[PDB]
């Protein structure tokens, strides 16, 4: 993934746990040589998965749980590190934002030419609920999506109840979530 993602990981770990903890994770991930991540440069996805695994081990958290926190963090990180106006432009509510997400990533992809963005499709079941389809070229990121949804809930001061109903990993086509939301 692009360096930006790995920078967010480093920043979250450093902020929540300290530089020493980050260094331990970075070493454990096999990344000691890398002095810094380059935000607009592409890295092997392996770099990210290794950080997740190393974070899980050092912190003593399940990786899924850690990925949820990271997904929530991303919503704040992007808004603060150069993508605040882009985020704002994608909407004023959770369901509008999710409808705009593919277009938001298309905009990102203008600048990040190698982007492999996720694809999100909404099927609205009421004015306060939807079924969300998450399609990706990558494995393992559903729990990050859960955190992102909670991050968006906070952003829009909206209560969000989310349950995963289909699993990419268990052979099923793609991840699907049932979501209810209210003010």
Q: Binders of ligand HEM among 114-153, rule CB under 6 A?
A: 115-118, 136-138, 141, 144-145, 148, 152
Nearer to ligand XE, 119 or 159 (CB): 119
What mask, x for binding ligand XE by CB under 6 A, covers residues 89 to 128?
Answer: ----------------------------------------
Is the Cβ–Cβ distance between 145 and 136 less than 8 Å? no
Q: For residue 95, how far is the Cα from the chain centroid? A: 17
Query: Which partner, ligand HEM, ligand XE, none, binds residue 75 by CB below 5 to 8 Å per kind?
Result: ligand HEM
Query: Which partner, ligand HEM, ligand XE, none, binds residue 70 by CB below 5 to 8 Å per kind?
Result: ligand XE
Cα 4 from Cα 39, distance rounded (Å): 4
Cα 127 from Cα 112, distance rounded (Å): 34
**Residue 43 is assigned to a ligand binding site:** no
- Residue 19: both structure tokens together: 């530089």
**Residue 107 is assigned to a ligand binding site:** no
CB contact set of 96 (below 8 Å; sequence gap of 6+):
90
Cα 41 from Cα 114, distance rounded (Å): 9
Query: Which partner, ligand HEM, ligand XE, none, binds residue 4 by CB below 5 to 8 Å per kind?
Result: ligand HEM
Which residues partner with 2 through β-bridges?
42
- Please report, as ranges, the residues that interact with ligand HEM according to CB under 6 A: 1-2, 4-5, 75, 78, 83, 86-87, 101, 105, 108, 112, 115-118, 136-138, 141, 144-145, 148, 152
């Amino acid at each position: 993934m692009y360096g930006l993602v790995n920078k967010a990981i480093q920043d979250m770990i450093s902020k929540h746990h300290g530089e020493d903890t980050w260094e331990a994770i970075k070493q454990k991930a096999g990344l000691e040589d890398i002095d810094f991540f380059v935000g607009m440069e592409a890295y092997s996805d392996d770099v990210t998965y290794h950080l997740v695994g190393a974070a899980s081990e050092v912190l003593g958290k399940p990786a899924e749980e850690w990925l949820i926190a990271f997904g929530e963090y991303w919503v704040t990180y992007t808004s603060e590190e150069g993508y605040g106006e882009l985020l704002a432009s994608a909407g004023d509510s959770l369901p509008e934002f999710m409808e705009n997400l593919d277009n938001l990533h298309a905009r990102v992809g203008l600048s990040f030419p190698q982007l492999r963005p996720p694809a999100f499709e909404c099927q609205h079941t009421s004015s306060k609920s939807m079924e969300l389809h998450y399609q990706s070229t990558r494995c393992g990121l559903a729990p990050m999506v859960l955190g992102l949804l909670h991050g968006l809930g906070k952003r829009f001061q909206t209560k969000v109840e989310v349950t995963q109903t289909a699993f990419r990993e268990t052979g099923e086509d793609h991840d699907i979530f049932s979501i209810k939301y209210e003010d």
